[PDB]
Symmetry: C4
Subunit: 373 residues, 4 copies
């Protein structure tokens, strides 16, 4: 019999023979008979009249399709109402289904201890939180500036030789360094004592940055100039520039950049690999071409790595240049090849950066909008 | 009872139990009974038969969705006809709703005084407006060219030493400067006297540009060579190049560029910040690597700022180059890191520029089309 | 009365009061009564049942909307069937209408004389056309190569001084030049005699290129070395490189590039203007900063144009570099500003180039497909 | 008679006169009478009620359109059910039809011998396959590193002169080279013996790479230092860098890069051509401008090729720079023109690379998903 379905007034009609093709759901089985007012002998359904279309099209073909325009939320609701599973969705239209679900998910995505642990993360909530955030971000800048300046040679001092400031006003800089390092270590200990998951903290990246920015001060004390060689402390002063990364707490762009750098590890690894092999190839070619010349600075393939990496980036210092015909031809080819091989990661990197940036933008916008509701 | 809705002939049907779920609108309440010709006992409605679908889907689920394709103008019209609010729109489809409304809004976006104030802004309307616009844009070019040329050393003059023109033909250039500055100040005073909101004018950017382009002439008169030091007037001649920005009135690209530069202040601030910290990091590394060398021009970290900023931009002058292995490795890394950190703002900047450009294009097109209607 | 419209079986229904709102078309007037079989008292219409929706929505609101998905061809057909005009389309959805019409239009876009004029343009049709096309494209390459080579200094010739080939083997190169120029002029005269619109030819760009590539040979004969100055013939040998543009007939990329260069004249003009003013500003700043130095090559603002244009392009030769603090700061700013101002035209230029390229691609594809039908 | 079509309950209605316009399909002919239960005198059809719309719209207009949103799989199914052909699809909407079909196709896209031939291609299936894959990828790196290092001049050896390692420890490097080449040739012979289509193998690119990476060893043995000139063996050591391309088996990025390089041969050819002609033009101009100068290194147009190719790439070594006014103007123009002409292929190249990359990504994702079903 031509069983008729006036689903919310829209009248479809089909043989029960095909309607029973898969009775392991609402309409195929016999529990739909609850809505079966035989006053009309039609299964009058108060559901959407345009999602049932895919239902009886499934019962016709054997698989259900997925149209584009309608909100996938109502789609999922109505397919769940009939007890049909999104897994059964034919591969005719399946990948954009996953796409829409993914982006829909992204759209819809204590007395003393927790007081501190909520003041630290969210500075704008409290006002003591700001007077801590800004005062600990000011000393970072102070330490950065004094580390930069302790190297400026200033003061002609005719009585003695020419000296950099950092070793002329020794204690005046030692006190600045000690003050900023003491504030750093105190605020770090307050980060620690207030961290609920004290093991998840030590394992985090920010704690590593903080401890590696602090230690070059104490290690400097244990290694006083009595027992040291002036080539093993340069590393300490170099590591003392890691206390510029503490701005990651105050800046959002830096954290977004870290996120998008770890999000693109595979393309970056391939960039490193392809760059390495291009450098080796072009360095071998340029070395054997420019091997014998007047004062050829291509003394070795390692010594040609420098020329190759300077040319591939279109830097072109000009201290190592070819002088033969083959050297010129292959330097020419090398520049273009480098331009090509370096322009591979840049697109996806900047795309991911802009995407994460605007995603956080719209996320906090929608969050404020929903909390203002 | 299965209340039936032949809305413009399309027949839906639902229980009143769910139809009364929210009677604070047209169909839920009892004022729809005006259209209730019980000659059919159906609320015959002469509205669109495909927007009512979302209505009764709201009355089913509890929230209404937003389909894509149909013009949101008719959508808003028909949701207002039923007295339902766009605020109630579920977050299932809400952000593209705001999107469409925004871009729809962008699409559908006196005897003597006002005579001058309408001649000034719109030069093409009158014809005296052109004979003022072009004649005041010609003297800008004259002043630019004479300021450029007053520095060319021309004239061998064997009897005396070698002189630049600007100080050989002193009065011949003084007269040009005076003429162009007098025209500038007169037209500026006419801008002022004709400005309805004389306070909004002085506060504007164009008035600032004009006054800072004019003052270096009068200040030059008060500071005659009797009481001056030749190192405090160079600033005056430098400021005399700001009278090239007056082309902002004649050019549309310059104003669009200013708009898109102020529209992207946050990305630009982050570019400045990230560039600063990258420069500091790489300058510290390169200074401690290249510290001890034959004639190492890395005498200080400030002195290494120059190398770092020249390398990060792929400029590569070649006057400061590393000479050790570590210096070379880190200059290599520095070039790539700079290429990366500089390619972040460029995409969004050029995108916004093209967008504003074409937006003004299509805007004046549609304006002329609507005025020709 | 509730007049009912079972348009192709889809039943709408409306009052005649609103149906008569605009009787200057098919349904508003009374000529629809032809399809009015009062056997049903319903205007039974065999048209699409989903374009009539916009019709009665117009008769409701007062303006008709334009949905996205359906082919605008059928849309135009059915709106013409009802005698309604696309002009009346409300601005609610009007610009994408023009968009779709435009791209639809782009999609659906002799005994002896005409024999030659069809052989010339389409080389692949005939086979004599190829033996003319390739033989006249071979002599272009011959002339290019001989012009390049006549300058190579080759032949040590111990008995005499060092000479370039072009003046050592004088007649051997004169004969090559004469042969290629004679073939050029003969084929040009055949272009002329076979051109139907002989005035549209002389006015074309290709004819200009051909005549300016030919004349430097005859003008060279009238200006024999008896009456000449060796500084007025260098221009002739320089112009003799315009006969490399004749490859425009054999290459499609060159013609596409010319099309996209003339298609982007406004952005190119603005690039030239903005570049000029940036150069002037930064040249003034760099000149007044670097004015007084040891051997400052910033002798003049014109002399600083060179530094500025070399820095803004990230070229960085390194022959003119700043040496003061202000010079360094402003060269640093200049590099970034140039990177910014040069990256404005590049996007739209390459986009237009790729677009025209692929448009011609798909155009000849669809043309071959339609001719194979 | 107004023949009515309640296709799955949706009621259309049309005259048979137009229904017989093309009786060479299901509905036009008389075999539809099978579904013609004259209990209703309507051809009751259990098909989709929204694809039949295009059917009777074809029977109205004479051509059928193609709407966007619905899955083209069901579209093709239902047009095949009525026996209508996609060829007949009017050009009103035809190209996006081909588009959708193409991307749908891309979406839905032994005892001893075959044991080896399945171990080789798929290393992750077996575990002996890994112990072969990694052990043969380790010796590639060994050979690369030893070829690079045999050129480093290391060992001051005061008793004798300065020597590179490769000729100081002769046999110690000969043994490394022999070992790696023997492993290479053995694994290559196992590639061969296990290849089912032994002719398709030798013709492949990987076999060419392997044989050209191996032969420079045996040819080195036949050409022992007894009968050789030291300028004909440098080519051998240069070719010995092709055994770095064998990483194509271990890397996926390299194979994707080869695919996208051969996929873009036409744009690359045009890049080469346009670059060549730009170089010739600017070299001629720069040569005739800079011809007569103090120590002008523009001795010839071939000698100016170097300047032109260094400037067009924004490399800017600075060893050849112009010194006249015309030379400067045209070098300035040359830099911009090169930036333009080089930025043409880069977009499409990187786009194709990212596309192939992500296509393989989603392809293996969907393959694993389908095999997990």
């Amino acid at each position: 019999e031509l069983i008729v379905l006036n689903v919310s007034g829209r009248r479809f009609q089909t043989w029960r023979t095909t309607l029973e093709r898969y009775p392991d759901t609402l309409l195929g089985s016999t529990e739909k008979e609850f809505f079966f007012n035989e006053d009309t002998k039609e299964y009058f359904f108060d559901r959407d009249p345009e999602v049932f279309r895919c239902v009886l099209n499934f019962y016709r073909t054997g698989k259900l399709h997925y149209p584009r325009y309608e909100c996938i939320s109502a789609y999922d609701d109505e397919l769940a109402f009939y007890g049909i599973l999104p897994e059964i969705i034919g591969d005719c239209c399946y990948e954009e289904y996953k796409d829409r679900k993914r982006e829909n998910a992204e759209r819809l995505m204590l007395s003393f201890r927790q007081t501190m642990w909520r003041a630290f993360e969210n500075p704008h909530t409290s006002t003591l939180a700001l007077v801590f955030y800004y005062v600990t971000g000011f000393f970072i800048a102070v330490s950065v500036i004094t580390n930069v300046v302790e190297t400026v040679p200033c003061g002609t001092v005719p009585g003695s030789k020419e000296l950099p400031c950092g070793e002329r006003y020794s204690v005046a800089f030692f006190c600045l360094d000690t003050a900023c390092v003491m504030i750093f270590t105190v605020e770090y200990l307050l980060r620690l004592f207030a961290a609920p998951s004290r093991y998840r903290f030590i394992r985090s990246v920010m704690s590593i940055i903080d401890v590696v920015a602090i230690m070059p001060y104490y290690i400097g004390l244990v290694m006083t100039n009595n027992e040291d060689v002036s080539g093993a402390f340069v590393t300490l002063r170099v590591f003392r520039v890691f206390r510029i990364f503490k701005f990651s707490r105050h800046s959002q762009g830096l954290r977004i950049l870290g996120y998008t750098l770890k999000s693109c590890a595979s393309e970056l690894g391939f960039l490193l690999f392809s760059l390495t092999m291009a450098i080796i190839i072009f360095a071998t070619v340029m070395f054997y071409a420019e091997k014998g010349s007047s004062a050829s600075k291509f003394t070795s393939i390692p010594a040609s790595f420098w020329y190759t990496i300077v040319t591939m980036t279109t830097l072109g210092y000009g201290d190592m240049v070819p002088k033969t015909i083959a050297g010129k031809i292959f330097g020419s080819i090398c520049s273009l090849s480098g331009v090509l091989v370096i322009a591979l990661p840049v697109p996806v990197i900047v795309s991911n950066f802009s995407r994460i940036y605007h995603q956080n933008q719209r996320a906090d916008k929608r969050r404020a909008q929903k909390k203002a509701r």
